[PDB]
Amino acid sequence: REVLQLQEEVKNFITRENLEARVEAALDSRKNYNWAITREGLVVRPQR
Amino acid sequence: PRYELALILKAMQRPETAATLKRTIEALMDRGAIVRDLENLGERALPYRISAHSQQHNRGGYFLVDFYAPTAAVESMVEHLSRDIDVIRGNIVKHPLTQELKECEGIVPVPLAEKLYSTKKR
Amino acid sequence: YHEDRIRAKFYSVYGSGQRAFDLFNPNFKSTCQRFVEKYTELQKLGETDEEKLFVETGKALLAEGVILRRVG
Amino acid sequence: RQFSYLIENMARDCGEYAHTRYFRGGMLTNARLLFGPTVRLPDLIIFLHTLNNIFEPHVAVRDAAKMNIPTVGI
Amino acid sequence: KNVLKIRRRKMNHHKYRKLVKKT
Amino acid sequence: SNEDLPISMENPYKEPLKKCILCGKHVDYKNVQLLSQFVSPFTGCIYGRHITGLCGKKQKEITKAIKRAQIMGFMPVTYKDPAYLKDPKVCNIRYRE
Amino acid sequence: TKFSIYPPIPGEESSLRWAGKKFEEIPIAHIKASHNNTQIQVVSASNEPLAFASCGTEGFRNAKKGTGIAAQTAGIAAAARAKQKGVIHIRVVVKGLGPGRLSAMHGLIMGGLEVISITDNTPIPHXGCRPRKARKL
Amino acid sequence: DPPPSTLLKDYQNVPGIEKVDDVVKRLLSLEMANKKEMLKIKQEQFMKKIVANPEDTRSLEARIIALSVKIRSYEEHLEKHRKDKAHKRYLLMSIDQRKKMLKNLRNTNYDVFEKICWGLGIEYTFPP
Amino acid sequence: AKHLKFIARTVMVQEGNVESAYRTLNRILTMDGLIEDIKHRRYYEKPCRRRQRESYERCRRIYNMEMARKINFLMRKNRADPWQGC
RNA sequence: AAACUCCAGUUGACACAAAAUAGACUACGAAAGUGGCUUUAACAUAUCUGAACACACAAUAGCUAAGACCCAAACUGGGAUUAGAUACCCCACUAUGCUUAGCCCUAAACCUCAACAGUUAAAUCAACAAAACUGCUCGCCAGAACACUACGAGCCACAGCUUAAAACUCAAAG
Numbered sequence: 001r002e003v004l005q006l007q008e009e010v011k012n013f014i015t016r017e018n019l020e021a022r023v024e025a026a027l028d029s030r031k032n033y034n035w036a037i038t039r040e041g042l043v044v045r046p047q048r
Numbered sequence: 049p050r051y052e053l054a055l056i057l058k059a060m061q062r063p064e065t066a067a068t069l070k071r072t073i074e075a076l077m078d079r080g081a082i083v084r085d086l087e088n089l090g091e092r093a094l095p096y097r098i099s100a101h102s103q104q105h106n107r108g109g110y111f112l113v114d115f116y117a118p119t120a121a122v123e124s125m126v127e128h129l130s131r132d133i134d135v136i137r138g139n140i141v142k143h144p145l146t147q148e149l150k151e152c153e154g155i156v157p158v159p160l161a162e163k164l165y166s167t168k169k170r
Numbered sequence: 171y172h173e174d175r176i177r178a179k180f181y182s183v184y185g186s187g188q189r190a191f192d193l194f195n196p197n198f199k200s201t202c203q204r205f206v207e208k209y210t211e212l213q214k215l216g217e218t219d220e221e222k223l224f225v226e227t228g229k230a231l232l233a234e235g236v237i238l239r240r241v242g
Numbered sequence: 243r244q245f246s247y248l249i250e251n252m253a254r255d256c257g258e259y260a261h262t263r264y265f266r267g268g269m270l271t272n273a274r275l276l277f278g279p280t281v282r283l284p285d286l287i288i289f290l291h292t293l294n295n296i297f298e299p300h301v302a303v304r305d306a307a308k309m310n311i312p313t314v315g316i
Numbered sequence: 317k318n319v320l321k322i323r324r325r326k327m328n329h330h331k332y333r334k335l336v337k338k339t
Numbered sequence: 340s341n342e343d344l345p346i347s348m349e350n351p352y353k354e355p356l357k358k359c360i361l362c363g364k365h366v367d368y369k370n371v372q373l374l375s376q377f378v379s380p381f382t383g384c385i386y387g388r389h390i391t392g393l394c395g396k397k398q399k400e401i402t403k404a405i406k407r408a409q410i411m412g413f414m415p416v417t418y419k420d421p422a423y424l425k426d427p428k429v430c431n432i433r434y435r436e
Numbered sequence: 437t438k439f440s441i442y443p444p445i446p447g448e449e450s451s452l453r454w455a456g457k458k459f460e461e462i463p464i465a466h467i468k469a470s471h472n473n474t475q476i477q478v479v480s481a482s483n484e485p486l487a488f489a490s491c492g493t494e495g496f497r498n499a500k501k502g503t504g505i506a507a508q509t510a511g512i513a514a515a516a517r518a519k520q521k522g523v524i525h526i527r528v529v530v531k532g533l534g535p536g537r538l539s540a541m542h543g544l545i546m547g548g549l550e551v552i553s554i555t556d557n558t559p560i561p562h563x564g565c566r567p568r569k570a571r572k573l
Numbered sequence: 574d575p576p577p578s579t580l581l582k583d584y585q586n587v588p589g590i591e592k593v594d595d596v597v598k599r600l601l602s603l604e605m606a607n608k609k610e611m612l613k614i615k616q617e618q619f620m621k622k623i624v625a626n627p628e629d630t631r632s633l634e635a636r637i638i639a640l641s642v643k644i645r646s647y648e649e650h651l652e653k654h655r656k657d658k659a660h661k662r663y664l665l666m667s668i669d670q671r672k673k674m675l676k677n678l679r680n681t682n683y684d685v686f687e688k689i690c691w692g693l694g695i696e697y698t699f700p701p
Numbered sequence: 702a703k704h705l706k707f708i709a710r711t712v713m714v715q716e717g718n719v720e721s722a723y724r725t726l727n728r729i730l731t732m733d734g735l736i737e738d739i740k741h742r743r744y745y746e747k748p749c750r751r752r753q754r755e756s757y758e759r760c761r762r763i764y765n766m767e768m769a770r771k772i773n774f775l776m777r778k779n780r781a782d783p784w785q786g787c
Numbered sequence: 788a789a790a791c792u793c794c795a796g797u798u799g800a801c802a803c804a805a806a807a808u809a810g811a812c813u814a815c816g817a818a819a820g821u822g823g824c825u826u827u828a829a830c831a832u833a834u835c836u837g838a839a840c841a842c843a844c845a846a847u848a849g850c851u852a853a854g855a856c857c858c859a860a861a862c863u864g865g866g867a868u869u870a871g872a873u874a875c876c877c878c879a880c881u882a883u884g885c886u887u888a889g890c891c892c893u894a895a896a897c898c899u900c901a902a903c904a905g906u907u908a909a910a911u912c913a914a915c916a917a918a919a920c921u922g923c924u925c926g927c928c929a930g931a932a933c934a935c936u937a938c939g940a941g942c943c944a945c946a947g948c949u950u951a952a953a954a955c956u957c958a959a960a961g
């Protein structure tokens with residue numbers, strides 16, 4: 001099952017052919033790893 | 049194995065930032081790497097003043113690069129980053145998602161230690 | 171005892187009701203104890219599962235006029 | 243101290259004795275000196291509380307076994 | 317525990333290291 | 340014999356073990372907003388497990404992540420980032436009074 | 437609004453203005469509270485020396501410099517040389533745990549200067565250089 | 574030394590891995606693994622080559638093979654780290670513990686003692 | 702040096718009350734440990750001596766934290782004698 | 788007091804040195820020992836005990852050779868104290884502490900409590916300390932001092948380490 005899941009993801013990996021395209025797309029999006037927590041153990045992601 | 053390259057580029061325009069990313073990713077493939085993704089964390093202000101290549105930086109762009117590569121390719125890649133002037137700071141760490149977290153049951157209370165001293169009348 | 175599992179769940183689902191215990195009175199029956207008698211009596215019928223048997227017990231008390239306010 | 247009054251009354255009603263106060267050293271082992279040489283010590287001691295106020299055995303439990311007096315205790 | 321048995325050995329070693337330096 | 344005798348059984352009323360706020364969650368060195376919740380607003384000093392309230396296994400993860408983010412250029416050392424000063428307080432420490 | 441003990445951040449605009457000036461434009465009073473002396477130096481936001489005073493420059497010598505009287509006397513002399521240049525509000529920056537750590541701050545108030553903030557810049561190394569050996573006195 | 578293209582011990586057995594992408598076969602090989610995955614394969618070869626029942630690993634024979642693969646690992650680590658005194662003690666103890674295994678094996682089953690000495694290239698030397 | 706200035710160990714004065722601010726500042730440094738750390742860093746504390754002090758400070762905390770737990774547990778019996786006279 | 792006064796303070800640039808908080812945690816390693824970050828390699832044995840005929844390690848100090856040098860610092864010098872002060876206090880600076888390549892192989896190297904297995908009952912138990920015991924094995928000790936010494940032997944050790952006595956003396960030592 002792990003091999004099958006891996007065989008699907010490999011399609012999305014960057015390659016020398018699509019390297020330039022992926023770079024431009026990355027410069028347009030943003031990934032946010034920031035999130036706080038309360039005393040009740042509840043995640044609070046920022047509204048941005 | 050699977051690694052993650054925390055890259056801090058210099059505050060540059062889009063044309064120059066794309067040439068550095070491509071220049072940096074082509075170096076990984078030349079060393080036997082298999083790039084997987086390119087995440088952008090956005091341009092922010094550095095927590096402290098960083099000095100690199102005779103330049104005092106106050107801002108930089110944060111980018112992540114998840115990839116697969118052999119163990120011998122890490123040390124050869126750490127040298128390449130040092131030479132690149134556009135890169136303020138770059139470090140490689142083992143990807144945090146390849147470290148399974150053992151399930152936790154809860155906090156176990158610890159009772160006070162007993163029988164530390166003889167039960168004699170001092 | 172076997173009925174301690176029942177009491178533990180009642181207190182978790184409902185908890186001690188407005189009715190206050192009277193420990194002086196030897197032949198005193200609390201709301202939870204009343205719930206145990208019905209829960210066990212329905213067990214004699216033949217039901218072999220806790221979830222359904224537990225749910226049916228609460229309904230019987232509500233029919234008898236007992237007040238069962240769940241913690242929720 | 244909560245039951246000192248109740249016990250002192252019972253002893254008086256049943257024509258018996260009570261000692262609910264601080265037990266001075268030698269009431270039993272050195273009685274003849276405290277009271278007199280012709281004193282008569284108890285033949286039976288009844289402990290309604292075998293502990294003192296510091297959660298330790300009453301000294302009379304040990305002093306009674308020295309004087310060969312049988313004890314009854316709760 | 318006292319160090320009276322250590323003080324005897326302390327002077328013995330000191331005088332011996334001082335005698336070797338002299339001879 | 341008699342049926343009223345007790346039985347050999349485990350405690351039914353026993354309560355589940357308590358958990359830290361971070362139990363079952365992944366601590367990553369890039370989440371500076373979470374890591375700043377366990378440092379002094381004034382000195383940047385890391386708090387202890389008697390202030391954070393975390394367990395031993397998770398207090399070690401926050402520490403290793405803070406020390407890694409500080410030297411990588413993600414988090415400051417001497418002070419807490421002012422941007423995260425208005426975040427929920429989870430630490431049991433009161434300075435002003 | 438409420439009051440906060442956290443200073444305004446230059447990146448973020450604030451509503452706290454002292455005599456029509458921002459928190460950043462306020463001059464700074466650097467105090468160096470040592471065990472045997474106490475130096476005071478006032479500067480502007482652009483790092484321009486305005487006034488300098490110390491327990492030694494005021495006449496105190498040897499052990500008499502490590503007291504609160506000489507520190508206060510030095511704070512009054514530094515607040516009288518800076519008040520002639522148009523200084524009213526200052527930001528204090530103490531460095532050291534010497535005797536004249538607080539007494540020097542009083543002399544600044546007794547010279548017509550108002551303290552809006554207090555900053556501690558005491559140098560603590562994270563390890564650093566090995567200090568001198570412990571004394572037997 | 575197993576080639577780098579060799580698949581991992583776990584993934585070689587699963588069905589359907591014969592026909593997959595080349596990139597997926599390069600991620601499941603020894604090239605993208607650490608040093609401890611190549612040693613799991615070196616041990617597998619010796620068992621099939623030498624031991625009658627590869628599946629049984631608690632037998633005295635397998636323990637010798639498992640330990641002889643560790644000894645070779647320490648010699649490759651000491652050829653680059655000469656001043657690592659810790660791993661130099663694990664080597665000298667592992668060589669002494671294998672000799673104690675070969676002694677008990679030569680005393681019980683001499684037929685297999687010759688097979689292991691030949692397969693692994695070991696020469697039992699009587700102590701002085 | 703490389704960090705921003707006037708953001709660390711900085712306290713603002715309320716209504717020109719310098720004393721109350723200084724007490725607050727001196728209380729933040731004390732709770733964080735800087736004050737004591739600065740006093741021990743005046744002279745070099747050798748490892749052997751620093752290991753003797755940490756062990757001393759840790760055994761004192763235990764004792765001081767258990768006695769206080771017993772004082773707050775017995776403070777309930779500080780009331781008047783209910784059986785006055787027996 | 789001397790010293791310094793091409794000194795001090797603010798700001799900026801700026802390490803072959805040392806590694807706040809976390810740590811009120813008690814983990815790793817045979818011990819020594821190990822508490823900044825990342826990566827690579829990696830932490831013996833499916834019964835135990837077992838080498839003072841061997842092998843491999845072993846804090847600090849120190850020797851040899853070549854480098855580095857912020858700070859600290861034996862030695863030395865100066866100032867002061869003192870009856871004197873070859874010390875305690877102050878200043879300055881050197882070997883040295885660091886790196887690389889070799890040697891040296893010691894410690895209150897002490898948690899002064901050996902390894903494996905097992906027990907909590909009986910006489911629990913001189914005292915103190917960190918409760919009292921069983922089985923098995925190895926190592927070690929037999930009054931004090933002479934003696935961490937002499938001779939002999941071994942060692943990259945040459946004012947050294949290891950092993951280690953005797954004569955005379957005492958009726959105590961502990």
Ligand code: FES
Nearest residue numbers: 152358359362394
């Ligand atoms: S309690 Fe489960 S992780 Fe802290």
Ligand SMILES: [K+]
Nearest residue numbers: 895897898899
């Ligand atoms: K010791």
Ligand SMILES: [Mg+2]
Nearest residue numbers: 317318319320
């Ligand atoms: Mg003593």
Ligand SMILES: [Mg+2]
Nearest residue numbers: 324325327328
């Ligand atoms: Mg002598």
Ligand SMILES: [Mg+2]
Nearest residue numbers: 835836837902
């Ligand atoms: Mg052995």
Ligand SMILES: [Mg+2]
Nearest residue numbers: 837838839926
């Ligand atoms: Mg030995």
Ligand SMILES: [Mg+2]
Nearest residue numbers: 845846891892
């Ligand atoms: Mg050594």
Ligand SMILES: [Mg+2]
Nearest residue numbers: 848849883884
């Ligand atoms: Mg050296």
Ligand SMILES: [Mg+2]
Nearest residue numbers: 858859860880
């Ligand atoms: Mg110096």
Ligand SMILES: [Mg+2]
Nearest residue numbers: 864865866873
């Ligand atoms: Mg002199």
Ligand SMILES: [Mg+2]
Nearest residue numbers: 856881882883
């Ligand atoms: Mg030098």
Ligand SMILES: [Mg+2]
Nearest residue numbers: 847848883884
């Ligand atoms: Mg040294």
Ligand SMILES: [Mg+2]
Nearest residue numbers: 819846896897
């Ligand atoms: Mg030691």
Ligand SMILES: [Mg+2]
Nearest residue numbers: 896897899900
């Ligand atoms: Mg010993």
Ligand SMILES: [Mg+2]
Nearest residue numbers: 901902925926
């Ligand atoms: Mg042994």
Ligand SMILES: [Mg+2]
Nearest residue numbers: 929930931932
């Ligand atoms: Mg003798």
